[PDB]
């Protein structure tokens, strides 16, 4: 055993206690039993019980008087013997929870007669005063009905055979005489002393190291008020108990629907909350109330889910323009998700022109995806390789430009998230028809093209000489667009292209050395086409696509404001 | 003893010698416990007294 | 629900100190309006320079003075501009909306307005409000006006804690981590000073702390919580005691800077010692929030046991119809809380619950409570009445969860839960139900009596606390005492408990007539609980002639008498068990020996019959190594089934 000072925290486990011996008062058998003496007359007079002496600990909580550790009995010898044990025993609260305020007790409760079995009391302190629990180590007590205590004079003794196991500095020859001083241990038995209403008690309780004790750790994060504290508040008054639900109106009720009539991302007060949970009829009625009723209202307990989705499908089908509202990853509701894509099962045109959108809600369309990824590796697991997502997929199987476009969006995503690699060859899985395959195939040879045109932008040269250049390998590119056939277009996926115009190709004088051609397409028309390559163009690309859905968004004004797409 | 090696793989700290001082908190009482124990003893040896000589031996 | 009719004039209070404070600077002019006081968790108002839409509050000086910017005028300011701001912030404080319009201010050009909304305050305030200058409004004059004698002084230890506050709410400014550390010290420090300020104002001798054991010592200073309790809220409010601070306080508390904390929250909990309806709900709503909230330290379930106990001694009736399904609602949350990190002692938590389901049973009482009050009405006694049965139907599903739960920690296995059990036999007077949960804890005592028999032992002596119907299951129970004659000499005591328990009580006669005419055969051990246990056959005798007759015939006393004459007796019985402990140590060799012949020269004699033949020449030699006399002589027939017992001990083993 090793000797180091160990703080409260930083100390792990519970308590323990062996107790040994005690202190033999001889006014009675030595059992403490029945107070015998020749005058027993008076013994069968008082119903003297003969009391078998046995043990009870339990500690006073802090001298704070409440009450925290567990009281705890052991088996029955002869206390004649006068019960010399050496018996560990223990309980459940750990050093680092042990509050260095605190305090040891027992109860010698003994074993008298017809209902009866006797009961002594005591009390002591844990830790030292230098925070040392009872030095860890061993002691002798003393305890009388009330207000006594231990001391150390042959328990100072036998705090120094606590020295022993204390380490002070040691030999080996020193442990053989300390063998020696088992014997000396031993002679230690010659004590004597005869008190009254009081007793002695030897228990031991040495451990390797001297404790050390403190108060918990905490964290502070994010003179302040916070966040999770209103929450406990207002869910505090969230109680609605009787459950009788009227369906009264007034004119308030114009005041609230304004109220409700507030944007998708604003985040609401606790008092329209509520007036907005007693609206719960008016929100039906509207179908501009259902997300903000939807957001108004929080969803953790099946208590309040119960109710919320049983109303989902019950409530007015919301406008596809505010569906794109509880559509976001903000709410994780598999009802939600679930009520959403039945309403988004409908797919219109502008549903290709929200596949940007779509491709960040895929992006965002991994939530604890490790139950569904085991799930697939499970149907994997077979044959060796060589949600929404299903409407997704029954979109993209429909037509094969969406399936296209749909491919497309997955290659850009394909570089920031590594599932989408595989997610692409899921949505090749996805589309059962091959017809759009073998063009995607085609389309697929362009990814050869752009490293060609890198190969292009790898050597370094003249202006005049990489134009020339670029000339001699838009000829060697407009070979292979007449040996390939016909692909879909970059500007519409219903157009496309034939071939390309050699001569009728540019090139750019800027640092990032785009490449223009002209290209022919199958309606025998000229098509003038700029790419760059070695930088990331999502950010201008989702600009552009904003700007043509709010220039859709001005067609729907019947107002053109002549900008071009 | 096994458990005080299970805590030595939690490795609390300790010091035979001397320590630097701990940061303030509860440790104050350990502290305080570190200067309840008497100590120099060495330091008396060269405190006075002149210097400290060495020993030469002989066959 | 922090807004309170006190809070309110405390938060008005605190303003007007520190209007008169800033007009004892010298200083003022700062424009009043609603967005100056902030609050926090210490539910304190806080008035800024800067109290930046919302109606402004007008200087009439300023106003009516005003001609062409005054003629050119500078910067000019009165304490009596900031008088009437205040005064208008202080009346939309009080209403809730201010006074603030073009028409009102029209109406002060008209000096006249109508007053509609107490006498002194109104006074007070209407003299702020006539003329800012002219009508001499004086704050100081008005804080010398206070109304309350004692809220002064109260208030003026708690400007006192209010500036320990301030202690506590004190490039490079100040550093983070001296907030939390003026929070925690800001609580030791507001506990420690908690003694004596409790003192000052409405106290009581008996306490949970250390000053309040002093004070307690006094008063009398097995293991419970309890100190002194509201009595009916203070009788009924008879010092007109109501307090926000000590909700303040708790809501201050509601963060933690270290393990003092726990006496932080403690101390909160102890500061719930006011009996408010209204706060208790919030106080007691806090305190589970606590228990779910930091599952770091252990000590967080205690603490919150602790308060939730405290809750449990508000002793107040519904006041509202809710209270009873939030009630309902409020033992699902703990229940969800219930589950947590493994290892984490729940048990003493589990028996203070279970202690506590009387005071659930009081909360349906408490039900029953709101049911009469909506029975005062006409025409609503029996639509309460239907209400508080179909409310009573619907806590039968409550209850059925609770047992469940109950049931749940019995059945887990963590014998500490087993000694929780204790309590929740105690208290489970409140539950009226089946005995199917005694069939699980008899269940439990036989998975016991496999391998936690030294606790199955101290299980069954509170096990005879059951106290219930159908004395059938009592005779099981006494075969559940020759089962617990098995092994464990706990077990031996236990089954003496249960034996005076039963002795006090009895229920058939001649069933425990035979009982005990084993089981006082079998009371001659030497052990010292033996001859307590041996002692209670006298006890039994005394509930005639021919039951003195038949014991007569098993009588080992010649010159028995009475009682007395049976002490004597039992005097004359004295025994040494040690040659019967190794008597027992040769009936373990036997039992290690062969007895497979029978040969020589099944009932229960047979027994004893197979016993003897066991032994021929080893047991003589054996017979001849203890002291073998005529008092020896006693052949104790009952350590043969003690030695089947002892072989079933065994047949725990290889």
């Given at each position: 055993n090793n000797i180091t000072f160990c703080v409260s925290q930083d100390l792990d486990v519970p308590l323990k206690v062996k107790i040994k011996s005690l202190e033999g008062?001889?006014?009675?058998?030595?059992?403490?039993?029945?107070?015998?003496?020749?005058?027993?007359?008076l013994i069968g007079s008082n119903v003297f019980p003969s009391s078998d002496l046995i043990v009870s600990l339990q500690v006073f909580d802090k001298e704070r008087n409440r009450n925290l550790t567990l009281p705890i009995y052991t088996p029955y010898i002869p206390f004649r013997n006068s019960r010399t044990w050496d018996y560990w025993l223990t309980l459940p609260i750990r050093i680092k929870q042990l509050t260095f305020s605190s305090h040891l007790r027992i109860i010698l409760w003994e074993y008298n007669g017809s209902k009866q079995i006797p009961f002594f009391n005591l009390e002591t302190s844990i830790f030292?005063?230098?925070?040392c629990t009872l030095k860890r180590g061993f002691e002798s007590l003393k305890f009388r009905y009330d207000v006594i205590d231990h001391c150390e004079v042959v328990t100072d003794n036998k705090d120094q055979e606590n020295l022993n196991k204390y380490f002070q500095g040691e030999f080996t020859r020193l442990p053989w005489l300390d063998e020696i001083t088992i014997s000396k241990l031993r002679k230690q038995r010659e004590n004597r002393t005869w008190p009254q209403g009081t007793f002695v008690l030897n228990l031991e309780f040495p451990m390797l190291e001297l404790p050390v004790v403190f108060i918990e750790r905490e964290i502070m994060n994010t003179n302040d008020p916070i966040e999770e504290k209103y929450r406990r508040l207002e869910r505090a008054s969230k109680?609605?108990?009787?459950?009788k639900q009227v369906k009264p109106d007034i004119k308030k009720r114009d005041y609230l629907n304004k109220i409700i009539?507030?944007?998708?991302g604003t985040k609401l007060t606790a008092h329209e909350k509520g007036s907005i949970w007693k609206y719960r009829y008016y929100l039906m009625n509207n179908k501009k109330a259902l997300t903000k009723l939807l957001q108004s209202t929080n969803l953790r307990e099946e208590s309040e889910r119960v109710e919320v989705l049983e109303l989902m499908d019950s409530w007015a089908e919301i406008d596809i323009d505010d569906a794109l509202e509880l559509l976001g990853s903000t709410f994780k509701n598999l009802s939600v998700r679930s009520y959403a894509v039945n309403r988004l099962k409908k797919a219109s045109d502008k549903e290709l022109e929200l596949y940007l959108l779509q491709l960040v809600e895929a992006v965002c369309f991994?939530?604890?995806?490790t139950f569904s990824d085991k799930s697939n590796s499970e149907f994997t697991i077979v044959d060796a390789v060589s949600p929404l997502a299903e409407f997704l997929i029954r979109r993209a199987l429909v037509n094969p430009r969406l399936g296209s476009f749909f491919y497309w969006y997955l290659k850009s995503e394909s570089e920031d998230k590594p599932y989408l690699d595989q997610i692409l060859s899921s949505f090749w899985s996805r589309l059962d028809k091959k017809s759009r395959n073998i063009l995607n195939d085609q389309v697929r040879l362009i990814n050869v093209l752009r490293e060609c045109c890198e190969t292009i932008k790898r050597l370094k040269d003249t202006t005049a000489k990489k134009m020339e250049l670029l000339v001699h390998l838009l000829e060697t590119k407009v070979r292979p667009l007449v040996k390939v056939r016909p692909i879909a277009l970059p500007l519409d996926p219903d157009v496309l292209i034939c071939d390309v115009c050699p001569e009728t190709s540019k090139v750019f004088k800027?640092?990032?050395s785009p490449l223009k051609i002209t290209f022919k397409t199958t309606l025998n028309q000229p098509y003038h086409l700029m790419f760059k390559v070695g930088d990331d163009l999502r950010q201008d690309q989702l600009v552009v696509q904003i700007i043509s859905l709010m220039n859709e968004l001005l067609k729907n004004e019947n107002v053109d404001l002549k900008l071009t797409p | 003893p096994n458990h005080g090696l299970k805590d030595n793989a939690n490795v609390k700290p300790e010091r035979k010698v001397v320590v630097s001082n701990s940061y303030e908190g509860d440790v104050e009482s350990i502290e305080k416990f570190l200067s309840t124990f008497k100590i120099l003893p060495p330091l008396r040896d060269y405190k006075e007294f002149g210097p400290i000589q060495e020993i030469v031996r002989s066959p | 629900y922090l807004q309170d009719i006190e809070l309110k004039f405390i938060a008005f209070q605190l303003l007007n100190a520190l209007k008169d404070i800033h007009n004892l600077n010298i200083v003022h002019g700062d424009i009043k309006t609603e967005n100056i006081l902030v609050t926090s968790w210490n539910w304190c108002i806080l008035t800024d320079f800067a109290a930046f839409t919302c109606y402004l509050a007008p200087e009439r000086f300023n106003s009516k003075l005003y001609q062409d910017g005054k003629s050119n005028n500078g910067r000019l300011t009165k304490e009596m501009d900031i008088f009437s701001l205040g005064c208008v912030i202080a009346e939309i404080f009080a209403?809730?909306?201010?006074?603030?319009?073009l028409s009102q201010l029209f109406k002060y050009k008209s000096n006249s307005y109508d007053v509609n909304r107490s006498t002194d305050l109104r006074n007070l305030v209407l003299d702020m409000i006539?003329?800012?200058?002219?009508?001499?409004?004086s704050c100081d004059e008005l804080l010398n006006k206070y109304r309350g004698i004692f809220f002064p002084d109260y208030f003026y230890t708690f400007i006192y804690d209010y500036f320990r506050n301030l202690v506590t709410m004190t490039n490079t400014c100040?550093?983070?981590?001296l907030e939390d550390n003026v929070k925690l010290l800001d609580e030791t420090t507001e506990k420690i000073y908690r003694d004596f300020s409790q003192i000052c104002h409405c106290?009581?001798?008996?306490?949970?702390?250390?000053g309040g054991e002093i004070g307690s010592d006094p008063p009398i200073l097995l293991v419970l919580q309890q100190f002194t309790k509201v009595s009916e809220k203070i009788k009924s409010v008879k010092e007109e005691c109501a307090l926000l601070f000590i909700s303040y306080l708790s809501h201050s508390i509601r963060?933690?800077?270290?393990?003092?904390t726990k006496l932080k929250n403690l101390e909160l909990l102890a500061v719930?010692?006011?009996?408010v309806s209204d706060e208790n709900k919030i106080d007691r709503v806090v305190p589970y929030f606590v228990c779910c909230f930091?599952?770091?330290?252990?000590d967080v379930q205690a603490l919150s046991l602790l308060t939730l106990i405290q809750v449990l001694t508000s002793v107040r009736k519904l006041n509202q119809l809710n209270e009873n399904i939030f009630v309902d609602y409020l033992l699902p949350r703990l229940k969800r809380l219930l589950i947590s990190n493994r290892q984490n002692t729940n048990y003493l938590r589990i028996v203070f619950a279970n202690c506590l389901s009387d005071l659930a049973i009081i909360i349906n009482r408490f039900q029953e409570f709101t049911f009469a009050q909506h029975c005062n009405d006409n025409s609503s006694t029996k639509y309460s009445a239907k209400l508080i049965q179909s409310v009573e139907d619907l806590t039968v599903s409550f209850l059925t969860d609770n047992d469940t739960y109950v049931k749940m920690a019995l059945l887990q296995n963590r014998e500490r839960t087993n000694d929780i059990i204790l309590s929740h036999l105690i208290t489970y007077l409140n539950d009226k139900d089946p005995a199917l949960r005694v069939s699980l804890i008899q269940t439990i005592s036989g998975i016991s009596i496999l391998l936690g028999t030294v606790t199955l032992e101290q299980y069954i002596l509170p096990?005879?606390?059951?106290?219930?119907?159908?004395?059938?299951?009592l005779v099981v129970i006494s075969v559940l005492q020759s089962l617990?004659?098995?092994?464990?000499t706990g077990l031996i005591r236990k089954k003496y408990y249960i034996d005076i328990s039963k002795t006090t009580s009895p229920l058939l006669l001649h069933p425990n007539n035979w009982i005990r005419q084993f089981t006082l055969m079998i009371?001659?051990?030497?052990?010292n609980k033996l001859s307590k246990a041996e002692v209670y056959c006298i006890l039994y005798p005394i509930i005639v002639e021919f039951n003195f007759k038949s014991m007569i015939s098993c009588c080992?006393?010649?010159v028995s008498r009475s009682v007395y004459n049976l002490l004597c007796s039992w005097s004359v019985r004295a025994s040494k068990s040690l040659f019967w402990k190794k008597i027992i140590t040769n009936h373990v060799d036997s039992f290690g020996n062969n007895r497979i012949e029978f040969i020589t020269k099944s009932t229960v004699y047979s027994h004893d019959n197979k016993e003897i033949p066991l032994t021929a020449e080893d047991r003589n030699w054996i017979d001849k190594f203890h002291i073998i006399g005529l008092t020896e002589?006693?052949?104790?027939?009952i350590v043969a089934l003690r030695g089947y017992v002892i072989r079933t001990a065994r047949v725990m083993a290889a």
């Open positions: 008062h001889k006014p009675l058998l030595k059992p403490s039993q029945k107070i015998l003496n020749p005058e027993l007359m030292n005063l230098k925070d109680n609605a108990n009787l459950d009539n507030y944007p998708p991994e939530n604890l995806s800027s640092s990032l | - | 209403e809730g909306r201010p006074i603030f319009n006539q003329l800012d200058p002219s009508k001499r409004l100040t550093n983070s981590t106290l009581d001798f008996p306490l949970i702390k250390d963060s933690i800077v270290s393990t003092a719930f010692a006011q009996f930091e599952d770091s330290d252990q096990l005879l606390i059951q106290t219930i119907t159908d004395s059938e299951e617990k004659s098995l092994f464990k009371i001659i051990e030497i052990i080992k006393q010649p002589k006693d052949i104790w027939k």
